[PDB]
Design a protein around this ligand. Sequence first.
Ligand SMILES: [Zn+2]
Length: 69
Amino acid sequence: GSSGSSGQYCWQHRFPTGYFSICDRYMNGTCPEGNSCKFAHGNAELHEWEERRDALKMKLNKASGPSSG
Ligand SMILES: [Zn+2]
């Protein structure tokens, strides 16, 4: 209604350490890590993560190196 109908998004969660998957522990019920976890904590959360990280690439690039062990 007010403050913009569509111009209002509420997505504030942890940052995706860098992984793009769901946390089995969290999905099961409880997770050991918690906030400093590398996995996602809820289908919804993941969605946001994919973005949060997609923001870094704004300046970062893929071509970095082989890093073959
Ligand atoms: Zn976790």
